[PDB]
């Protein structure tokens, strides 16, 4: 799930025809120390002491737009008319669009 | 260029005469069926006499 080195032109949506970015990647790791203890028994069972992703994931008005120049009051709703929907802001391919614009005077 | 022109010209007539033979065969089958129907009617004719 990492980005490779140097030859970073052979793996892009250029061939994927991907229209929702795949996954953010990086090339950097802090120098890890640690005897990397084992904290389960036989089943992925975390020993009660150690923490996990504590059941975080377990398992339309949103659209791309720039505010540009459309009446402030209409634009203000649009921002709210974009957000306040975590059913489309959290997970499951990403569900998350972008935004831009500029204010008025 | 001249050879290509002649080739497409030939291809046209090929196509329509293809299709023409096709409908001729279909119509021949249709008259087969109707001839057989007349034969059956003639077969049925006899008894009332």
């Amino acid at each position: 799930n990492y980005s490779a080195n140097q030859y970073e032109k052979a793996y892009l949506p250029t061939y994927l025809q991907n229209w929702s970015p795949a996954r953010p990647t990086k090339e950097k790791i802090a120098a890890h120390e640690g005897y990397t203890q084992i904290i389960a028994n036989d089943r992925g069972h975390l020993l009660p002491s150690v923490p996990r992703s504590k059941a975080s994931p377990w398992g339309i008005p949103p659209a791309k737009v720039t505010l540009t120049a459309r009446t402030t009051t209409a634009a203000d709703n649009l921002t709210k008319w974009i957000h306040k929907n975590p059913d489309l802001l959290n997970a499951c391919n990403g569900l998350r669009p972008e935004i831009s614009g500029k204010p008025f005077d | 260029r001249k050879v290509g022109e002649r080739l497409e010209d030939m291809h046209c007539w090929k196509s329509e005469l293809q299709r023409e033979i096709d409908e001729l065969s279909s119509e021949t089958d249709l008259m087969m069926a109707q001839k057989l129907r007349l034969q059956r009617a003639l077969d049925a004719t006899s008894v009332p006499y």
């Binding site: 025809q17 229209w19 929702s20 339309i60 949103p62 659209a63 791309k64 737009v65 720039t66 540009t68 120049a69 459309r70 209409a74 669009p97 | 497409e8 291809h11 196509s15």
Partner: protein
């Protein structure tokens, strides 16, 4: 590479797309079977058809379009037509139940269960394609099945896929002819839903299509085939840049960037100048100047808008055929000098020239003339607000006496949504003069 996808929603959108694909197979010399002659053009699907067809090692030119429908009636005989062998069987989306002219019925009752399937068709088209610049959406504002079903799909394709273009094509409602009085209900519903998502919406009206033909094509008795012939020519002309090169090549990306001035309003108007009968073409001469006069003659537009009642912002001309830069630049210079033509003082230049060597072809058993120099006129003017102005007084009376709502509230809406569209429109009309004001 350079390709795009066509979609045909509404039972009206299927016969027109049929003619378009019927037109498209001619210039490539496609036989109805699905294969070329013994001549060598087949492969992995890479030739003039690669942008349009998918002729893989199987040798069958597979068109890159999906025809979606909700009634088995009109979608079956085409599946028994002449090129049904060409068409991918499960690309021809059929249904068993109609939307009954109801946007919401198609948009809610039946839309959920079928969009997932067509989304599967979209993705399995998406994976096989390479560059896929945009989509070709063929619909209709008074969509009996077009209205509701197009909206939901263009929502779903927008939200998952937002980084490309989406090209929209619908018949505009006839200003004084209405084959349905619930047509204003969904039409404004479609418009307000599409303003914030649609990239490029292009309209057309059948009345003036008829009005043209008995004017100069001289046929007092055309047919839908004739109607579909003209519009199919329009989309053929705009895609000739993809099909053929020229002095310069232009793309839909340029069309989007250069045509729309500002957000919301993205509704230019098409036009095709050399509309004339074969006999009138026979003993007359065509040159750039007169067709440049003809293209801007007010009676040659398919949309009932007096251009003098409005003002121009953009004008795109796409010369397909044997032309030279000299006369056209001189001719357009004279056009700039004209006084009756009134672009906004805001735009110094609003002209996007397209040059294509290829003379447009006639269709066998057709009705058009034989043209050497053609031009397509996609343009946007302020004379269009009257149409929506026509719609609102039509709609404002109707909603006050709220006819037919018993059906709409009867299957699961309320009046708030109908409220939104009116101030949505009231925004569009009020914006139209504000930008119309210099």
């Amino acid at each position: 590479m350079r390709e795009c996808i066509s979609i045909h929603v509404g039972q009206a959108g299927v016969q027109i797309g049929n003619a378009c694909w019927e037109l498209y197979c001619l210039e490539h010399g496609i036989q109805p079977d699905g294969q070329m002659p013994s001549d060598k053009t087949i492969g992995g699907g890479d030739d003039s058809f690669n942008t349009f067809f998918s002729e893989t090692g199987a040798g069958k030119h597979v068109p890159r379009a999906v025809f979606v429908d909700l009634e088995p009636t009109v979608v079956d005989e085409v599946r028994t037509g002449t090129y049904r062998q060409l068409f991918h069987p499960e690309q021809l989306i059929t249904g068993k139940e109609d939307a009954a002219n109801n946007y919401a019925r198609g948009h809610y009752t039946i839309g959920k269960e079928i969009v997932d399937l067509v989304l599967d068709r979209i993705r399995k088209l998406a994976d096989l394609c390479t560059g896929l610049q945009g989509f070709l959406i063929f619909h209709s504002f008074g969509g009996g099945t077009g209205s509701g079903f197009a909206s939901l799909l263009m929502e779903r394709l927008s939200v998952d896929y937002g980084k490309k273009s989406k090209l929209e094509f619908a018949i505009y409602p006839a200003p004084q002819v209405s084959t349905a009085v619930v047509e204003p209900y969904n039409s404004i519903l479609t418009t307000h839903t599409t303003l914030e998502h649609s990239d490029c919406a292009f309209m057309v009206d059948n009345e003036a299509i008829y009005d043209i033909c008995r004017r100069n094509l001289d046929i007092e008795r055309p047919t839908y085939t004739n109607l579909n012939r003209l519009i199919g020519q329009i989309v053929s002309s705009i895609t000739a840049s993809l099909r053929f090169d020229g002095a310069l090549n232009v793309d839909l990306t340029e069309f989007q960037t250069n045509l729309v001035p500002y957000p919301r309003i993205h509704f230019p108007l098409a036009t095709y100048a050399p509309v004339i009968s074969a006999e009138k073409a026979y003993h007359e001469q065509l040159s750039v100047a007169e067709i440049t006069n003809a293209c801007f003659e007010p009676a040659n537009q398919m949309v009932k808008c007096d251009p003098r009642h409005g003002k121009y912002m953009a004008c795109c001309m796409l010369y397909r055929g044997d032309v030279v830069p000299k006369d056209v630049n001189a001719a357009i210079a004279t056009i700039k000098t004209k006084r009756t033509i009134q672009f906004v003082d805001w735009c110094p230049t609003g002209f996007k020239v397209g040059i294509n060597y290829q003379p447009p072809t006639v269709v066998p058993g057709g009705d058009l003339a034989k043209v050497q120099r053609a031009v397509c006129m996609l343009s946007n003017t302020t004379a269009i607000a009257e149409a929506w102005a026509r719609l609102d007084h039509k709609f404002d009376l109707m909603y006050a006496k709220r006819a037919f709502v018993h059906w709409y509230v009867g299957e699961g809406m309320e009046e708030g949504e109908f409220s939104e569209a009116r101030e949505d429109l009231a925004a569009l009309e009020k914006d139209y003069e504000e930008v119309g004001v210099d």
